[PDB]
From a paper:
The HIV-1 envelope glycoprotein (Env) trimer is metastable and shifts between different conformational states, complicating its use as a vaccine antigen. ConM is based upon the sequence of all group M isolates and stabilized by an SOS disulphide bond, whereas ConS is a SOSIP—UFO combined design of a group M consensus soluble trimer. To interrogate the effect of EDC cross-linking we carried out cryo-EM analysis of trimers bound to PGT12232 Fab fragments, and solved the structures of unmodified and cross-linked GMP versions of ConS at 3.1 Å and 3.45 Å resolution respectively, and unmodified and cross-linked GMP ConM at 3.4 Å and 3.85 Å respectively.
To chemically stabilize ConM and ConS Env trimers whilst avoiding the known pitfalls of aldehyde cross-linking, we used the zero-length hetero-bifunctional carbodiamide cross-linker 1-Ethyl-3-[3-dimethylaminopropyl]carbodiimide hydrochloride (EDC). EDC activates carboxyl groups on acidic amino acid (aspartic acid, glutamic acid) side chains that react to form a covalent amide bond with proximal amines on basic amino acid (lysine, arginine) side chains, without the addition of any atoms to the molecule. As anticipated from the SDS-PAGE outcome, differential scanning calorimetry (DSC) analysis revealed that cross-linking enhanced thermal stability by 18.7 °C and 17.6 °C for ConS and ConM respectively. However, comparison of the unmodified and cross-linked structures revealed a striking near identity, with a Cα RMSD of only 0.45 Å between ConS and ConS-EDC, and 0.5 Å between ConM and ConM-EDC. Strikingly, close inspection of the ConS-EDC and ConM-EDC density maps, and careful comparison with their unmodified counterparts, revealed a series of high-confidence cross-links. Most were intra-subunit cross-links within gp120, with an inter-subunit gp120-gp41 (intra-protomer) and an intra-subunit within gp41. Inter-subunit (gp120-gp41) cross-links such as K46-D632 will stabilize quaternary structure of the complex consistent with the SDS-PAGE analysis. This should increase stability and in vivo lifetime of the ‘closed’ state of the trimer, thus maintaining bnAb epitopes but reducing exposure of non-nAb epitopes such as the V1V2 and V3 loops and the CD4i surface. In this respect, the inter-subunit cross-link K46-D632 may be particularly relevant since as it is likely to substantially restrict molecular movement. Antigenicity and immunogenicity of the trimers were selectively modified by cross-linking, with cross-linked ConS retaining bnAb binding more consistently than ConM.
Numbering used by the authors:
A (entry chain C): 114 to 138, 153 to 178
B (entry chain B): 54 to 57, 65 to 138, 153 to 184, 189 to 309, 312 to 321, 321A, 322 to 359, 361 to 397, ...
C (entry chain M): 6 to 9, 11 to 67, 67A, 67B, 67C, 68 to 95, 95A, 95B, ...
D (entry chain N): 1 to 82, 82A, 82B, 82C, 83 to 100, 100A, 100B, 100C, ...
The structure:
Amino acid sequence: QSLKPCVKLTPLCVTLNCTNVNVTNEIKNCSFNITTELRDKKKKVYALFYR
Amino acid sequence: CASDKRNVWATHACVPTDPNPQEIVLENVTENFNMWKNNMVEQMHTDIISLWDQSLKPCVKLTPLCVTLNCTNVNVTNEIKNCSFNITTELRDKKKKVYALFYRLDVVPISNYRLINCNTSAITQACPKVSFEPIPIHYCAPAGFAILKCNDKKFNGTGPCKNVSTVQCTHGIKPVVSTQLLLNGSLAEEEIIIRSENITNNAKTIIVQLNESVEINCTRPNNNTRKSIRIGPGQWFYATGDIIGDIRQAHCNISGTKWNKTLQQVVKKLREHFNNKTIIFNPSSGGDLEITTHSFNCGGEFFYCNTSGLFNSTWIGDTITLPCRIKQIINMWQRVGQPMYAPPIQGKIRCVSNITGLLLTRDGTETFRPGGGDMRDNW
Amino acid sequence: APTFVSVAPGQTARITCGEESLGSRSVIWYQQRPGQAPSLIIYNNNDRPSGIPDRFSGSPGSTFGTTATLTITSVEAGDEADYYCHIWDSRRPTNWVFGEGTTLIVLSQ
Amino acid sequence: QVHLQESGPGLVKPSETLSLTCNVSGTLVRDNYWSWIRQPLGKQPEWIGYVHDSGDTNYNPSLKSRVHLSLDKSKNLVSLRLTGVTAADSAIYYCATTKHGRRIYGVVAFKEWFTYFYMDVWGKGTSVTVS
Ligand SMILES: *[C@@H]1O[C@H](CO)[C@@H](O[C@@H]2O[C@H](CO)[C@@H](O[C@@H]3O[C@H](CO[C@H]4O[C@H](CO[C@H]5O[C@H](CO)[C@@H](O)[C@H](O)[C@@H]5O)[C@@H](O)[C@H](O[C@H]5O[C@H](CO)[C@@H](O)[C@H](O)[C@@H]5O)[C@@H]4O)[C@@H](O)[C@H](O[C@H]4O[C@H](CO)[C@@H](O)[C@H](O)[C@@H]4O[C@H]4O[C@H](CO)[C@@H](O)[C@H](O)[C@@H]4O[C@H]4O[C@H](CO)[C@@H](O)[C@H](O)[C@@H]4O)[C@@H]3O)[C@H](O)[C@H]2NC(C)=O)[C@H](O)[C@H]1NC(C)=O
Ligand SMILES: *[C@@H]1O[C@H](CO)[C@@H](O[C@@H]2O[C@H](CO)[C@@H](O[C@@H]3O[C@H](CO[C@H]4O[C@H](CO)[C@@H](O)[C@H](O)[C@@H]4O)[C@@H](O)[C@H](O[C@H]4O[C@H](CO)[C@@H](O)[C@H](O)[C@@H]4O[C@H]4O[C@H](CO)[C@@H](O)[C@H](O)[C@@H]4O)[C@@H]3O)[C@H](O)[C@H]2NC(C)=O)[C@H](O)[C@H]1NC(C)=O
Ligand SMILES: *[C@@H]1O[C@H](CO)[C@@H](O[C@@H]2O[C@H](CO)[C@@H](O[C@@H]3O[C@H](CO[C@H]4O[C@H](CO)[C@@H](O)[C@H](O)[C@@H]4O)[C@@H](O)[C@H](O[C@H]4O[C@H](CO)[C@@H](O)[C@H](O[C@H]5O[C@H](CO)[C@@H](O)[C@H](O)[C@@H]5O)[C@@H]4O)[C@@H]3O)[C@H](O)[C@H]2NC(C)=O)[C@H](O)[C@H]1NC(C)=O
Ligand SMILES: *[C@@H]1O[C@H](CO)[C@@H](O[C@@H]2O[C@H](CO)[C@@H](O)[C@H](O)[C@H]2NC(C)=O)[C@H](O)[C@H]1NC(C)=O
Ligand SMILES: *[C@@H]1O[C@H](CO)[C@@H](O[C@@H]2O[C@H](CO)[C@@H](O)[C@H](O)[C@H]2NC(C)=O)[C@H](O)[C@H]1NC(C)=O
Ligand SMILES: *[C@@H]1O[C@H](CO)[C@@H](O[C@@H]2O[C@H](CO)[C@@H](O)[C@H](O)[C@H]2NC(C)=O)[C@H](O)[C@H]1NC(C)=O
Ligand SMILES: *[C@@H]1O[C@H](CO)[C@@H](O[C@@H]2O[C@H](CO)[C@@H](O)[C@H](O)[C@H]2NC(C)=O)[C@H](O)[C@H]1NC(C)=O
Ligand SMILES: *[C@@H]1O[C@H](CO)[C@@H](O[C@@H]2O[C@H](CO)[C@@H](O)[C@H](O)[C@H]2NC(C)=O)[C@H](O)[C@H]1NC(C)=O
Ligand SMILES: *[C@@H]1O[C@H](CO)[C@@H](O[C@@H]2O[C@H](CO)[C@@H](O)[C@H](O)[C@H]2NC(C)=O)[C@H](O)[C@H]1NC(C)=O
Ligand SMILES: *[C@@H]1O[C@H](CO)[C@@H](O[C@@H]2O[C@H](CO)[C@@H](O)[C@H](O)[C@H]2NC(C)=O)[C@H](O)[C@H]1NC(C)=O
Ligand SMILES: *[C@@H]1O[C@H](CO)[C@@H](O[C@@H]2O[C@H](CO)[C@@H](O)[C@H](O)[C@H]2NC(C)=O)[C@H](O)[C@H]1NC(C)=O
Ligand SMILES: *[C@@H]1O[C@H](CO)[C@@H](O[C@@H]2O[C@H](CO)[C@@H](O)[C@H](O)[C@H]2NC(C)=O)[C@H](O)[C@H]1NC(C)=O
Ligand SMILES: *[C@@H]1O[C@H](CO)[C@@H](O[C@@H]2O[C@H](CO)[C@@H](O)[C@H](O)[C@H]2NC(C)=O)[C@H](O)[C@H]1NC(C)=O
Ligand SMILES: *[C@@H]1O[C@H](CO)[C@@H](O)[C@H](O)[C@H]1NC(C)=O
Ligand SMILES: *[C@@H]1O[C@H](CO)[C@@H](O)[C@H](O)[C@H]1NC(C)=O
Ligand SMILES: *[C@@H]1O[C@H](CO)[C@@H](O)[C@H](O)[C@H]1NC(C)=O
Ligand SMILES: *[C@@H]1O[C@H](CO)[C@@H](O)[C@H](O)[C@H]1NC(C)=O
Ligand SMILES: *[C@@H]1O[C@H](CO)[C@@H](O)[C@H](O)[C@H]1NC(C)=O
């Protein structure tokens, strides 16, 4: 019940471009495209994810 | 409830009325009433919100319209923007360019504009077959309980009532929504009654009930047409089409003489709580359109009217015309994040309402201003 | 530039002007005899100035979606002139030019 | 009866200044709106602008930078000045009085109305050629 009233991440099921360039000398630095509040626009964003 | 298509407040979630309601006078009964501690108010407020929300569930969301709009004024005037944009069709692989007129108040600049709520929430359009005309709702007691009614003619908000009758239930109450003036309510029987929780505070509102109504004539003079746009598989959007004839401003008409008599009487009775000080009235001091103007639903359109032409006077020991604005995207009961889109209504709109009361507040000569957006005060 | 129409003497002429009205209008009609400065026939849709006879009248400006019309009944030889039209419209910018007129040809000279 | 008698150079050269005069008789220039109309041959007329006292003067936007209008109250003349004349300016020019009135369609308090103008008294005009 507690998880019903909130955001689904189905819009994030896109291909990610992931590297380790600035992380270590386990965690990946991934870039990907997302939607914005405007349906005709997309932008590239970055996030870290655990392997 | 007890009450008696598809009206927004006719969900049939509750029973029909008693064709012959009963009332029993209780001789020799004194009862202490307090309208400010009355939990029937909270009950009504909650039920109204629920009926509203239930009624808006089964219909089209406008999230597919959150696109950039290209808006101009090329064929409108020598407040309304002519916007073009792309939409989906029932075929997911196709898009088409469409045109619609929008009111300036519903559109915010960022390929120039966006709808006002696209970065905060989903806009749901009103279900097109559902009217917003108030239906009287009676509130009736369950087994084991009783509702007592006060019959003292000069009773204000609190204190002992010397004439108490028991009823099966209340009279029907119309869920009229308004922000500065009260419309279509009950009238006082003998005199204007000023009710407040604390007349000497500034933190409390004052409800003034009139014993005589004042008519207000409101109109939307533009001959707007309706255009139906297909967004998807049975998903229709209703856009304002073109406008036939002149572009004119919406307005309301109040008789000058009745308004002045009404104020003389309101002031006369206000001087009974206040010392013999100069009393002045001013326009609402600030906030957004919902609070600074008098809003109402007239035939399905949402009007906001400028009342500075009424609350502008000083009291010591013709026709008034109020200009108005129209909006299609609204957020009722201060619920942020839950906008609704009112589809345009085809043809001209006119309605006549009864001003039956006022909502006033005080500034920290005494100053009074219209106001109070908290719906519990209307109920 | 002008539209050409013709009538027999005694017939009614129908002269049109401009595009469809958008809002309330005030149409002004003028007449030009070849070789002469033009003069006013109708102002404010149907108010003729002194000196203009009842045979000249026009369409109302109260309607929408139609063009201006000038009606001349009982057309005579003295009505052979170009008719010009200047239209004011509440939803349009001021027209600084006249629209193309109509030449009224009176037959059987 | 108002008579408007026009005069001017007749022939001007390209890039020159065209200055026409309307000699007003039967009325004083200060009590009327004045306007100028020009009619290229074979074309319907064009309204240049109008002039009056109290600053109530306006111009055809295409000529606004080129045309200057004024009223000489000492001479009872209406002046029309057009600069940078070209081939397109050859036209018959006319002096006319202007009357005005108002069309009201909505609420006057909200200014739902407009001023309109019409030309009742016309002069004979003058023919102007630009070399
Ligand atoms: C809240 O309260 C407010 C305020 O009280 C209300 O606001 C009112 O709203 C109404 C409409 O909603 C407005 O009505 C319009 O008024 C204008 C103005 O009319 C006035 O002036 C006329 C003459 O003025 C001119 O001539 C005089 C002469 O000396 C000159 O001095 C002056 O400077 C000027 O040059 C008067 O004749 C007229 O009186 C007549 O009408 C009265 C109406 O009630 C009537 O009571 C009188 O007895 C008398 O009959 C008045 O004083 C009107 O012009 C306008 O009507 C025309 O325009 C509309 C819009 O398109 C159109 O639908 C009408 O059919 C009409 O159009 C005809 O006339 C045009 C003239 O320009 C012409 O161009 C058209 O082609 C057409 O003519 C054809 O038909 C006529 C029919 O007779 C025919 O004779 C012609 O030959 C031809 O065939 C409206 O009446 C109010 O003005 C406005 N009040 C204010 C103060 O703004 C508000 O509505 C209320 N709100 C609510 C919710 O209730
Ligand atoms: C489409 O929209 C445009 C833009 O608004 C509009 O054009 C405007 O038209 C009005 C009315 O013709 C013009 O207003 C007149 O302006 C003159 C002076 O203007 C000066 O100041 C302005 C300021 O912007 C300048 O732009 C301009 O260049 C000038 O410097 C005023 O003197 C006029 O006032 C008289 O007429 C009024 C009625 O229209 C009266 O209410 C007023 O009391 C005055 O009349 C009285 O005095 C007169 C003289 O004694 C007398 O003869 C009268 O009988 C009466 O007693 C007026 O304010 C406005 O400037 C135009 N704007 C532009 C940018 O050109 C179009 O007309 C409109 N078209 C349609 C179809 O709606
Ligand atoms: C305070 O109390 C006041 C008095 O009760 C209220 O004023 C009243 O408000 C109501 C609701 O706005 C007004 O009722 C509307 O009146 C419209 C005018 O119609 C006129 O002409 C009709 C011609 O046949 C005639 O039958 C009417 O009797 C009247 O003379 C009506 O059109 C409107 O109808 C609505 O409901 C119908 C129910 O079946 C529906 O069929 C109508 O459909 C039409 O419109 C839709 C719009 O999309 C079209 O799609 C349809 O094809 C069709 O064209 C329509 O939905 C309704 O009856 C009432 O007139 C008014 N009284 C006065 C004196 O004006 C105040 O509003 C209250 N105050 C507040 C704040 O609420
Ligand atoms: C928004 O619509 C306007 C419509 O006016 C476009 O602007 C120009 O409109 C004229 C109208 O005749 C066209 O001839 C021009 O070609 C249009 N401009 C261009 C660059 O095509 C305006 O461009 C539109 N904006 C968008 C984002 O489409
Ligand atoms: C969604 O966009 C609107 C419009 O840009 C934002 O509203 C503005 O918010 C700022 C915050 O200071 C105000 O100053 C502006 O006056 C607001 N504009 C309007 C038109 O009201 C809104 O805050 C944005 N919402 C989110 C969640 O970012
Ligand atoms: C006390 O209140 C009762 C109502 O509860 C009043 O009784 C009503 O009086 C009117 C007078 O016209 C009748 O029409 C109603 O039918 C009566 N109602 C009932 C339920 O009987 C009574 O008059 C009030 N008494 C006083 C002293 O105010
Ligand atoms: C607005 O107030 C008027 C006057 O109080 C109401 O009209 C009358 O109300 C009485 C109530 O007993 C009826 O008996 C009359 O027959 C009504 N008049 C007419 C002409 O029918 C009016 O109904 C009120 N309007 C609203 C919306 O409540
Ligand atoms: C409503 O009427 C009641 C009854 O008169 C008022 O209550 C009295 O208020 C005074 C204020 O000093 C007290 O001293 C009395 O003891 C109160 N009476 C009772 C029975 O409690 C009440 O203040 C009035 N309210 C308004 C806004 O008029
Ligand atoms: C009604 O409002 C008055 C005025 O604000 C209240 O009186 C004040 O009460 C506070 C409480 O300590 C005092 O400090 C102030 O000095 C009082 N002001 C005056 C003018 O007496 C009053 O208490 C309120 N009554 C209720 C029931 O809330
Ligand atoms: C608003 O405009 C509509 C559209 O013209 C008017 O209703 C009718 O629309 C049909 C569409 O074919 C026309 O054939 C009718 O002639 C129109 N009616 C009339 C009386 O002309 C509608 O009446 C207009 N509303 C108002 C109040 O003028
Ligand atoms: C609001 O509209 C009503 C009618 O719908 C107006 O009432 C009419 O007013 C005229 C004024 O001369 C009277 O002759 C009529 O007999 C009235 N009709 C009715 C049914 O009473 C009312 O005056 C309008 N209010 C305003 C402020 O203009
Ligand atoms: C209601 O209308 C009045 C004017 O009729 C507005 O008051 C004006 O507001 C502007 C805002 O810049 C001021 O510059 C003017 O000086 C004000 N006029 C007066 C007479 O004070 C008022 O703001 C409008 N109110 C609402 C809520 O829209
Ligand atoms: C309340 O009414 C007064 C009197 O009508 C208004 O006073 C006007 O204020 C403006 C401010 O620019 C002056 O230009 C006017 O000349 C004043 N009127 C008079 C008759 O002198 C006052 O503004 C009104 N208040 C509101 C909010 O509209
Ligand atoms: C994001 O979209 C842009 C659009 O050109 C594309 O070039 C880029 O490669 C996309 N990013 C990823 C990680 O796919
Ligand atoms: C709608 O889509 C077309 C596709 O080519 C595009 O050219 C047009 O600019 C879009 N319209 C807007 C207002 O973005
Ligand atoms: C719309 O975009 C054009 C492009 O330059 C800009 O000039 C104009 O000011 C913009 N208008 C708004 C409301 O952003
Ligand atoms: C409303 O109350 C006042 C009190 O002064 C009274 O004079 C007036 O007549 C009453 N109005 C009605 C309709 O009874
Ligand atoms: C209302 O009463 C006041 C009292 O001074 C007066 O000044 C004002 O003109 C009156 N208004 C009307 C509409 O009679």
